[PDB]
Structure formats: structure tokens, C-alpha cells
């Protein structure tokens, strides 16, 4: 069921959010915010900078120190305010999906039924953690009494990519405000604008001054002071694999800030030949096609046995070929736009390597329409290893589709890539999906399934596609600084 | 009661340790170990390179194959073979200490009663977490069964310092093996000796070849070679942070190696006026003179009660009054050198700012003897927080005592430094203990003790002291990585 | 004789200035000009960047090519269009002097009488060597006839300091394009206007499109994609030492691109027992209080014998105590404000470690005014070699004094620092003068003067203040690249 | 005339050369050196490092002082030593030609005939220049005079390569000496032996102790201990482009030491229709294959017009299966080994890469002997601009051939590279090989014929493959450093 907004969405929150007050730029300057399915401007938004991080930083700071509000507040305070967020969200739901819709061009069932549900079941999942992150007692040798405190760590920076901006605004300041961290967050150049909403309802769900801070901007301005600002204790990021490694060797110049990074994938897929052909096809083509291929985790390699290969390329073409391409707001459309030119440029020039180094194009393989960044749906079969295509994250929506004999050499070839943010694997075989998820070097792996990813569950790479792991029980440890206290007794019994 | 060895050390093994066999360097070289209380020369070492740190990480890197020994063996049998490692380092229990004391300036009472104790229950320690390391299964939504698996990182590069060269060996080994590492170990060019006996012990054990590699060599050549590796899945380094920061920015360049850090310390004890006085002294004497001042937690800040201080100075300079210098091999002797000239220059250095920017020098305060790199026991009061010697790590046998009267400022002024790795805080009172212990930022606070530490909990620092835990449950998380399995199912039941 | 507009001044180019014709910026982004003695805006620009330096590199490497107008043109043809331009600038003299004045927080008098002769001077200079720039025919050894090219280099990325906007702009443009450069130039961010009229006046001289472009914006956006760019061929640029690390770095990064830098100083004056006493008092006042102290060559430490060191101190506070602070368009006034916020701040910040590191304070230590960045002038004696103010460059109306009894001892302090860009010796002996200026490690030595800087001498830094020579026959070597040409012959002759 | 040594070489000087004394390494330790003819180790050689390379640079400071006897001496007397230091080179002709020959593996014939001779020719025409080193006198604006003078930089770190040892030895001492510089140098690894011998001889002829100082060992210590030390006024470096970066970016972030760099090429030859077919074989054939390839400047891409290309490809592969490989002490011997595993590795994988990627392969290919590192002389015609073998230098014995039709096409193709070195062009029409040089964007272009150097003319590259000029009256440009002195005076006159 699919509710839509009964009147024209008007932009309202355009500048930094510091204290819970709304600031004009240091330097006086705006930047502007387009619609990527139009080219059409938006609006223009407060451009945040060194200067503007640093007074993001004093107030979360402030906010962090020992007596002040948000240290001192029960956990489970910390929690209600985390569900009163989510509520207030909900509330919002028909906006803010409209709002993602148009800055991210993002399908809008897409933006109000996935990307909507997500933040606010995430949401409410942290919620819940905030009075259960528990430390230890510790039989430590000798006459002493040993407890750790799980702390937050302080201020964390935290940077959101474009793919999915309120999404990940809420992966970011769920687990760092369940911990009781404080935060500065630079939402993306393209997607500011959800951002700055959520803001607006953080203030009134009552979050003290200083907790949370959003500072629009762009990254080699904003990002980079942030990543070696000498005073934030942590930075988290999301985005391409290259950005990550400046993002670590920053922190690394700097103070030492913790880093964790979610970056890019080629992410495999493995289908046997005693597959469901028709779920494995399904699961496969939504892997690499969702969100207009803009996806970290898009199932970019797709490895067939033989003998089900041509069977499951034609009928992969064939689910490609039923799109229907527009503006994201309109009902019946099926793919929206790419994010920005840049991208769209990425895309067409990856297409044309496909094209040159001899893969089979099945269809697609150019833009469409005179506005917007649009990309036809590609599919190529008969890919191979050494192609461009098969190494590049293309991060658009372009399908590469393999066939392999020996599953020996097959998961050498899933493996072997600096990559391993994600893989899937398509049998019947209770033996086959339990020996080769084990064997896959990835961070998550499917089974008969692809792109399930629930709040419950610790998402992450191997290797270069991130360091750490967000979500779950697990995420939560990212955000918190281990103190041992150690306490001389006379005499100790277990 | 302390035994010795009844025949003098003979120096066995002093070659590169890959794949359970000795190497020569592929270079040819080798380099001069010294005894640091003679400045004698004790043998030579083959010296690896870049060249050969890549004959340990092809090894590391096979051994942790899919369907490998280490990979397929019960993690019971890991533990089994750490529990034999330790035996056989009981059994060698003289001829590591002395060899430990003669290589490494280190008092042999110390060496034999704490060192090697210590190795042998931290190994003990790690050998019952190996078969105890469990994963979860989640409760995701949708109808899917998840797990998630806490599976070994892979390659794993470790950087030994020279201060405590045999029980950081076995703090970085223990954990990464009973996680199911492999690794490559590059012990200091000081004091690779040791590491290259127990290497000897590894193979005798029975570990698989490959899981263990030693290659001795310097940082700049060695240890540069292991934290820009491209195939090393993560870093460990204890050293300073100057350092540690140089670490952390080669993995950024290289691979995104995972990195964990234990640098170095200013860590600050704080005693209050109705602390027990004689204990709070002879802790707080200890926490800063223990093996030459050549510890990163060193209690190189002693903040006191203006009401106390006066009497706190004197016993204080009493105690310090009290030593036997000379070589650490000697019973009754209770001062052993520094390390090497390095170190030994950078703390004269240190104690002229002291005396120049006027600190009341109450004893010590130059070097001794015509042989070894010995330097006296030195104290200054009416240290002031601007002072280089309140600031700068001395890692050197060098005591800092301050007064305070408001506790308020005395917490600001303990916590106003980039490093945390530790602090100290003597009372009777709860309330206090309490409270300050959990003001202060540093990853270990001790109450009414100092400098305990022990296998069953966590040790690391805050901000630049380090990233990551080490030991406890915790320093478990750091050598594992997680992978997350979902897998498709008709229906789920709670 | 000072004449002055009889009009407000309009601001009438603000924009791109590439291929002879005025662009938006690629973002559509300005940014403000501040006037510094009103804190006031006085118009905005169009904000270059990367994608902007792209497009005037383009531009220049177009104008650059074998066969274009610029490369195929005379020689004394690219004279002519130099000394058209000088022609121009002097007809626009008032308007440029008003707006260098009003943009810069120059003084009127100065701007007009110093600034616009010395542009119009070195442009007229390095028109005359263009026909002038000659090769070698070589007495090579062999049957071979030898000779070089001394070709144009290429694209020249040049960065322009806020100082001496048009001045800078002249020395930078001139040289270059006397030679047969196509230039990429950035003017100050603070201080872009008058280029961008000069930019007008090269369009109106008739110089071919894409030989001069010009490009407003930020140093860590526009300066940084000059520095970094891969088909730059030279940087130049004047500024911080700081900043000129950067540079040289990110060049050798690159495309190991030629550099030359003309960076800051610490620059002495050596005033001699035997000198001239009120000659040296003025010289060395001039030298230091200069366009209030914004001067790369500020004599910024004065040693003057002991025995005269009183009188040289109570002429030197005497003639301080002179100045009439104010806006710089207005006549009487003598000293304008500095040119913002940073380095006001900078100022006042290495004013007070002067108070408190012990200098005596003789005359000013504060601000002054309700609006701008104004400075009282500010003299201190009995200064030493270890304070912030003797080792550190100010930049500010700040004149430090210091006594000497040695000259041996005098002349090793001189040379005691990282800078040397220029040095002064007051004495009436012949041979003091010649041997202590061979003695001094500094770029240019004035002999009973100081600050006398012409078109016909080079003009540069020994060690950190710089690499390379401007101006006289020798900065016309650091735009041209020399190629050897050997021919084959049957037989030669002399 | 070829005359040899009548007694089998003794290897004597093997130690570090600091202040014209023998010193062992600061470590103890010592490197192995090897004959490339035969795997062979020749001896050990002391082993210099950071430590090593502070006491050469406090020596060469020492000697550079104000007052020392190399500062104060003749300049007449420094071209004296000059000219006594070839005197003996020449009486120990023999010894250090097969010196060179054994431990670079050069053919005896060229070491005697080519390499010394051009050593004491390079050397006695820098004698000529050093008192013939002139500043200005300059009509300066204003009542002032106004001078200049060449004065030495001060003290220059030289890194010689291991192709032409004792040559570039040479062409970086004798600038520096002659114009008055103390040098530190590093000779490479594989060949320090003839820099150890000339400094016996720089001792003999009578030097100022600390002029010349001589440091053997490794790049990534000595070398980068040279190019980031911050008392070295400059650095000079001969090698790899990709070191050449480095070396660039390390004086940035020291001391902005001034920076001469020689790097690699990919250097191209035009061989018109009208070309004497004959010579443009020979020389092209030399142009690749001297001193088995290992030249910066190798002819390593040749563009032969339509019509002659293949008469040029047959002459051409005729030629270079003339060849007899061997030990380069031999007489009849004409191709010697390759210098070592690393560069022996680069060339046979380089060489695979034209194989596979389709060029013709006419001779040669693999590897030759048992004992060596011996490449077969190898010819590829065919070869497109795409391929590794036309982008890469090889710097081993592997020709390049290529057609092509259209002159502007084939200038552009030429110049399609980062490199610049060298370029040769063969024609017997005047204005075509005035304007064809003129186009090429190299720093030496020959015309009918190739390889010519000599010490009368500069030598270095345009773009990547250098900075800055060696030789002729411009190299010694580069050790200079200009100071002005400017004298104020009552009337100046014409
Ligand atoms: C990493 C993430 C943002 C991917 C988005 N996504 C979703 C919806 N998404 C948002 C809410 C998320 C939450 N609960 O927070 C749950 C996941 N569905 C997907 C994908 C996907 O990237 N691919 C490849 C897919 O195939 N499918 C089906
Ligand atoms: C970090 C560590 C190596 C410090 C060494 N240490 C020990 C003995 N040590 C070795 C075995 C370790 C184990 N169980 O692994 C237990 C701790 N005792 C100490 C200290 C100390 O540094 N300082 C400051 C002290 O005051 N005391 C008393
Ligand atoms: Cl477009
Ligand atoms: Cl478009
Ligand atoms: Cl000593
Ligand atoms: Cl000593
Ligand atoms: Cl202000
Ligand atoms: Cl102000
Ligand atoms: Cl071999
Ligand atoms: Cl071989
Ligand atoms: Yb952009
Ligand atoms: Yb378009
Ligand atoms: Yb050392
Ligand atoms: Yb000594
Ligand atoms: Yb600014
Ligand atoms: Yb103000
Ligand atoms: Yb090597
Ligand atoms: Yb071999």
C-alpha cells in the first residue's frame, strides 16, 4: 500500500545544525542541491568547512563532558529518545521518502516502503541496546577486584554517503547515541537535504544541545576535516574504497582517531547446477539492479555452471528488458536516474571497456532520455576475469553475468579481488552452501537469497571493502572505549 | 626462590624461522646483537628485509588456506598446542630468563618471577579461549536463518618491542593463534633472541608449518616491509606513537590492513589526602621505576594533595634512595641498564629540560659507571604541567611529583594530555574511587595499586596510546573477523 | 604628486577569465571580497576549482601548440604586446592604484607612487628581453654541429600572494610570457580584483586567446589543482614557507612538474658601531614597518652594536610613535589595517609571547579601531635569539631590536635560522661591508639601504625562503627549457 | 689501441670516506658486492646509513665554512685540483676501467675507451670553468650599485647510478667542486667500487678534508637519509622516474632543499623516406643496444616511414644478430650481462608483454647462459603505441620498431609520452630537420645520428624525465646560488 504526499513537498531545512540551532556558514557561502532525474536545481544549502567542522566539534565537545546532560541521563533515557526519534520519523514518513525521492533519485515505493521501514526499524533496534551494553567482572590473579566500563569513546565523526542518505544517517547516530557518543555528521554533497529534516526532529524529540550536529559540505573541504580534526576520537564513512584509504591515513597523521569504513564490492555470486534457476535468476538480477546499481554490496559477478549457464542468461535479459525508466515520483516507473554526472560518466565509460575487451552485450549498453542521468539496464554474458567489468565497481546498473565448470577454480575466482563486502550462493546441497560460504573471503554471505540486511545482523567487509562492522550486537562495539578498573582488596573469594 | 641456569648460556638460534626451518637472509647479511650492561656484542643475527618478509607472508598466507591443517584442526587442538608451547617454556624457564636478562638489561629476579611467569600463564590463558570462541545465531526478520561465524582474520603482521620482548611475543602470539591466525612476527632489533628460542619451542610443539614465522630485523627495513604488505590482513604494534602513527598510515596506503596499536603513556596517579600514604607511595614508586622506567604504562605523573605532599616527596626520594646498580645478572643488584644509546640519550635529554626549566631535582639525576647505558634513579618535585618533563614520555627512570589542592582541576590537568593509556587514583574513600576512576580517560585505572596486570583482562589505551584491546575476552574480538550467513527458508519458527 | 580617481570606483570583472573571455564557475559557486579596513563585503567572484583550472590548462596547453599565433609570432612581437599592456595599466593607473588600495588595505599614496610604477616598470623591463632570450652554438667535440634552444617551458601555473596583488602578478606574468609561456595564474582569494582588470587589459592589448588565463578561488582547491595538475609544466608561487613545502610536494607527487618559490624571512640588519646612525634608523624602520609589516623581506631582526644600542632604540621607538592609523584611501593617514582575520590573529598572538617571553615592550603591543584588522605599531628591545618573535615570521607591524658586541658571534645569529631571503649591513668601511656580506646567507644584501627591489636584479631566497631567482637576466632562466640540438657533419671547422 | 692490466685487480678501498679518512659504518656492518658476469661476490663493502650520512654532512658543513681553505682558495686552485684529480685518474686508467668492467659488467673496450675517457675529458672541462664562474654588475634604478655573485649553493648530496658509475661520478663532482660546493655522494649499491678508488685519488691530488665525502650503501637508507636531510642545500639523483618522485617529494617536506634530477626515457627516433638508410640503422642499432641497453637515453622507440620500414627492419635485426655474449673482460666480447636479478627480472617480463600482446618478434627473447644475467638481443617490429614495450622503459637490450605515414601524426605519437629525454631524427632535408627538432619535446635531439654527448653541451630532459641541466655552461648554473648586494650610494654614473 502505497500512500503518497496530498501536496507539494517545500524545502525548509537548508543550514548547519549545531547545539540545536540552525547556523549560517562561517564563510557566508551556499552550495546548490540539484534533482539528478531533472538537472533542475533544488534548492542551496549552508557549505560547511574547517571552520564550520570545528564548531561542530567544540559543541559535541561540550556535550560529551563528564557531568553534562547526555552523560549523566539514565541509558534507558538515552533509548526513549532514540524511539521518540523513530516515532517522529514515521510521523514524517510521507515527507521524507518524497524528500529522498526527489534529492537521491530513488524509486519512491522504493523510498517509502524499504529505505523509510529500514530507518526507522533500525532505529528502533539501537533504541533498545542503549540500557543493555553491559561491561564485565573479571576473576583477575591476585587480591583485586577488576570491572570494565564500556563507555562511548567521545566525538565521532561520521560521514554518509549519497546511495542511501537516511538509511545511513541512522546506521551512524543509532549505535553512536545507544553507546552515548556525540556526533558530527557531513552528510553528502548530493543528499543533504533528509539530513537536515531528521535534524529538525532530533530537536524536537529533545536530544540535548551538542549530541547531535550536522554539518552540510562538501568532502575534500568538510570530509577531510573531520578525518584529521585532533579532537574527534572516531570517524566512520561510507563510500568508494579509494576515499577509505585517505579517510585512515588522515586519522593516522593526525590524533589516531578509531576508523571503521564500509566501502565498495564486487561482490560474487556462486549458482550450482542443482539451483531453484528462477530464484537464483530473481535474487541475482535485484542484486545488481536495485537502487540503479548504487549499492555497495551489487552482485556484480555472476558465475553459472555450464550446463544452466544459456538458461540463465536468457532469462536474466529477459527480466532486464521490463523496465521502465523516468522520474522516481511517478507511479508504474521502475528505474530513476543515476546520482550525478560524475557517476553517470564512471558508468558509460565502464560500459564501453565491456563493449571493446569483447564481453557479449545483451542488451543495453547506453544513456537514455534528454534530462537526467539515466543509464539503460546492461547485461553482458561471457564476461572474464581480466575485463574492466569484472574488476571495477561499476556502481550503476550493469549486470556481468560468467560461466564456470570446476567449483574448486570458481571460488579462487570469487576470491580473488581486493574486494569482499558480500557474496551469494545458489544450491540445494546442505554440504555445498555450508562448505562454500565458509570458503568465501566476504562479510556476508546468502544462501538461495541475496541484499538481506535486517538490523539484528553485523554487516561488513573483508579486505578492502571496510574495516569493522556495523549493526547487531556486534556494531555496537565499535562505539565503545573498553575501561579495565582494577581495585587492590585485602582479600578476594570467587 | 630463585634458581639459576648451572652452565652459561650458549647462543643456538639466531636465524630467520619460516615454514619450521632457519633461513638465511636472502641479502646475506646479518646484524650485531649487544649485551646493554657491557655494551658487548653477544652474536650475530640474520638480518631480514622486505625480500624476506615476503618469504613469512607466502608461508602465513599458505598455511591459512581453505583445507589447510591450522584451517581443518579442531580448535581444541590449537589450544592443545599452545598448552605445549607453554610447558616447553616451562621447561626452558632459566635459559629464556637469562637469556631475557642478558639481552634485554632486565633484572634477572624480575625476568625469571615475572616475566616468564607471566609468558607461561598468559599462553595458558590464551590455550582455553581457542574452543570457546563462538559465533551467534540471530533472530533477522523475514524468513531466513542467519549466523554468523567468528572466523580467523588471516595473515596477521606483529611488531614486538624491546622493553618486555618474550611476554609481548606471547600477548600478540597467544590471541592470534587461538583465533586461528598465522603470523609473522618482527621481534626489535635489540632483543630478537628470545623470539627465536621459543621459535625453536613452535616447531618442537608440533604447530603446522607456516603458522608461526620469525624474522628478525629493523623497523625501518622489516617492519616498514610488514605494515605496507599487501597480502598482510592486519597489524599489531607495541611501540611509541610516533611510531604507531607511521603503522597506521601505511595500511591506509596499502591494503586497509586492520590495525591495533599499544603506544606509549603519560599516565597520572592521583593521591588523595586520606589515602593510605605508605602504600600510595610504594605503588606509585613502583608504577614509574619498574625495569628501568622502560614501561608504557609508567606512572610518570604524581599528582598530591598539597596537604600530603610534602611528606609523600620525602619518602618517596627514601625509596628511591635505595637501589643497587649494575649488571642485572648479579643477585642483590636491583637496577639494570637502559636499553641501548637511543634511549639512553633521550633521557639525559630529558632530565637537563627538567633541571633547566626548574624542577626541584631531589636525587639521581646523571648517569653511572664507565660500562652500560645506566642511568641514575632521578626524582623531581615542584613539577609544573608545562615542563617537557610532564609532557614528553621519558621511558626512563625519572619521577615526576606534583601538588594539587582542587580535584576538580587535578582531573582536568591528569586528563589533559593526547595520550591514556593508564592512571592511578589512591583513596578510602568509594564515592571517589568511583568517580574518579570514571572521569579519567585511560584504558586501565588502577585504585590503591598500580601496574597490575593480568591475562583475564582487557589492557589498552585511550586516544593516542593506542587502538584496540589486548588480553581479557576482548583482545579475543580484535583477532577475528566476522562473517554473517543468511540463508532462505520456507518459513522460520521463534 | 598624488592625483586620485574622480569617481567612486566600480567593480565591474569579477568572473573566469579563460581563453580571452569571462566564465561562471563549473559549480556556479562565488565567493566574497572583504575590504580589510571596513570588514565590509565588497562584491563577489566567481569561485574556481578543479574542474575550473581544467578548463584554463586546456586553454593554455591549446595556446601552447606547435603552430599556434603565440608560438609562431615574433619575439619582439610578444615584446610589443608586453610594453601595449605596460601602456594600458599606466592609463588605468588611478583605478587600479583605488582598487588595489581599497581590496589590499594598501595606502593610497604607496599604491599609486610605488606599486603602479613598479608594475608598469617591470612589465616595460621584461618586455625588452623577449627578442633578447638567446641560445649556444657549442664547440662539441666529433664532426658535429651543436647548438641550443631556450624554448618556452609550457603552461606555467602561477600563484599570486595578497600582498603585492598586482606588483606579484607582474613579476609572475612578465617573466613567463617575455619567454613564450601560456600562463595559468590564481590570484589571492583575499585579493583577485585587480587581476582580473589586468585580465581585461589583456584581452584589450590583443594577446592571442589562451596565453593568459586567469582563475579566482582558494588555495586548497584552486592552488592544490595547479600544484597537483598533470600537464602543468612549472608552479610558481609566493606565500608561507609552509605552504611552499606543500607545493614542491605535491609537484614531485605528480608530474614532477618545475618549481620555483619565493617564500617568507626572518630577514637581520647587521648595524655597525661606525654607521651612519640616522640612516640605519630609517632604513631599518622602513624595512620592518612597510606596508604594515607585510613584507616577505621585513627586517624583522635588527643587532646594533652595544655601544650605540640606546640611540638606535630611542630613534627607533621615536620614529614609530609617528603613524596615523586609518582607512588607506584617505590622505594623512600612514598605516592601513593588515589584510584579515588569520594573520591579525597571528599577529597579536606573537605580540603577546613577546610580553611574556621577557622583551621589553617600547611603544604599541595592542589593536586599535572599532572596525579592520589594525595593529598598533609595536617595537621591543632587548630581544633574544630563543623568543617566538625572533624566530618566527610575523608579518606584522612588529619590529624586533637586539644588541651585539661580537661580530663574528652576530654574524653566525644572522645566519642562525631556516630563512634567507635578504639581509642589511650598515657601515661606513669598505671592507666590513664586502666581507660581511659574502659572510651573510641571504638572497640579496643591502649595504647602508635595505628594501631596494628592481626590475634589472634577481631577486630570491638562500635555504627555506626559496628556490630560484625572479627578475634580472637570471629569473628569465627559470622560464626556459634549454634544448641540445647536435647535427651530424662530414667535417668540421672552428 | 686497447691495452689491459698485466696483473689480476686487488679490490683495496671498501670503506666510508669522510674527511679524506677511512671509516668503518656507525652499525658494524657491511654489504655484499657482486660481478654480474658471473654471480659472483667481489668483496664487502662498508655498509653507510642515516648515521653515516650525518657524519658526511657535519664534515662537508665543516669544509663549506666562511673562512675554511675550500672556501678561501683561488678559484683558480679549485680548477687545479680539478685538473690533477683527471691527471690521475688517467695514470690509473687501466685499473679503473677493468674495476668498472667487473663490477658493472661494461665491456672492457667501452669502460677503457668510452667511460674513461670520458671521465677525465668531462673532468678537465669543469677544471676550466671554475675560475671563469662570473656574477653582474647591473644599472639598477636609483643612486645605488648594485652586483652579484655565483657563490657556491654550499653542501650537495650527489646519488650516482650503476650504469655509467665513474661518468656520472664525474659529471655530478666536478660542477659542484668547480663552483665551489662540498659534496656528500652515494654511489649505488651494485657499483661503489670506482667511487672508493677516485677517493683515494681526491686524497692524493690534495683536497680540502670534507670536500668530497663518499658514502656506499642503500637508497632506501643512504639515499633517503640524503634526500630528506635537513642541512644538505641540494640534492642531485640520476635513476628511475619513480624514484625521482620520491626524491622530490622528500626535499619538499624537509628542508626545500633545491632538487637536479636525470630520470629515465622512452626516447624516439623519426626516420624519414629521404633518410640515408645505412646511418639511421647504425646509429638507431647503437641507440638501443649500448652497454646492453642500460642507457636513460636508449632510442627505444623507432618510427621508420612506410616505404623504408621494412628494408629498416631487415638491416636492423641483421645487425643485432651479430652479437657474442660473454664476460665483458674478454676480448671479442660484445655483450655483457645485465646489471642485476631486479632489472634481469623487469626486462624478460617486459618482454613477454611484447610476445603476447602481438608484436612480430624478429630475434632474440629469452635469456642466455648458465651463470649471468644475460638477455638475448632482441627485436620487435610491428609495435604499437599501446603496448608496454612502447609505453615502459626496458632499460635492457630489446629494439622497438614502428611504421608510419604521416609526419604531424608521428611528431604527435613522439611526444605522446610523460618522458622527454632524448629524441633523433633522420633526414637529409634542411627545413625538415630544423622544425621536426624544433617540434620534439626532449631534451637532446640528434639529427643523423644518435648518442652524441660531450662535456661542452648540457644534457637533461624535458617533462618526467628530468629537471634542470648537467654540463655545458648551463649545469654549472645549477651549483650556484645568486646573491645580490646592493650598495647605497650618493650619485651613480653610467
Ligand atoms: C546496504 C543497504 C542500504 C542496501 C539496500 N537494499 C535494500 C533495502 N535496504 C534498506 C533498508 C535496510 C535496513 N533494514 O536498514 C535493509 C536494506 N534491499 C536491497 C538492497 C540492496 O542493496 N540490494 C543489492 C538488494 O538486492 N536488495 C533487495
Ligand atoms: C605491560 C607489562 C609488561 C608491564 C610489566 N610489569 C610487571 C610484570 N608484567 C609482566 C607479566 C605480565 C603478564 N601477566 O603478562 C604482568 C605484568 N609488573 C609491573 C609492570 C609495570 O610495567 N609496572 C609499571 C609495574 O608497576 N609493575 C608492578
Ligand atoms: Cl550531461
Ligand atoms: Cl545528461
Ligand atoms: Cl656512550
Ligand atoms: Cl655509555
Ligand atoms: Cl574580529
Ligand atoms: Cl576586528
Ligand atoms: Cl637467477
Ligand atoms: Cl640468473
Ligand atoms: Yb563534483
Ligand atoms: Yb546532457
Ligand atoms: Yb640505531
Ligand atoms: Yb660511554
Ligand atoms: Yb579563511
Ligand atoms: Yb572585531
Ligand atoms: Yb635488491
Ligand atoms: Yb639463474
Redesign the interface.
Known sequence: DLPVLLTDLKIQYTKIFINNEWHDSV??????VFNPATEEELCQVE?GDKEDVDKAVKAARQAFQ?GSPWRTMDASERGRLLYKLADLIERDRLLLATMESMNGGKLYSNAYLNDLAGCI?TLRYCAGWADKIQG?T?????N?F?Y??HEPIGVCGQIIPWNFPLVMLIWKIGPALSCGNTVVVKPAEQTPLTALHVASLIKEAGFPPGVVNIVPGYG??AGAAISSHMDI?KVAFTGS?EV??????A???S??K?VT?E?GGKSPCIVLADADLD?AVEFAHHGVFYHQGQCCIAASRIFVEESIYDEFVRRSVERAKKYILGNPLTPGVTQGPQIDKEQYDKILDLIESGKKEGAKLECGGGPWGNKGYFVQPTVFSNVTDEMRIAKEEIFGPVQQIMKFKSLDDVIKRANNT?YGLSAGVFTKDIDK?ITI???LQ????????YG?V???????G???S??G?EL???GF?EYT????????ISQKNS
Chains 1, 2, 3, 4 share one sequence.
Open positions: 564563510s557566508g557561502k551556499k552550495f546548490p557549505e563528564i526499524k564485565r573479571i576473576p583477575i590473579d591476585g583485586f577488576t570494565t566500563r575534500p573541504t576520537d574504497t577509505g584509504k585517505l579517510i585512515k591515513e586519522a593516522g597523521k590524533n589516531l578509531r569504513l566501502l530464484n581486493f552452501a560460504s565458509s570458503a566476504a562479510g556476508t554471505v546468502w544462501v538461495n537469497c538481506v535486517s538490523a539484528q545482523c553485523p554487516f561488513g573483508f579486505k578492502m571496510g574495516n562492522r547487531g550486537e556486534y562495539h572505549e573498553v575501561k579495565t578498573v582494577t581495585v587492590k
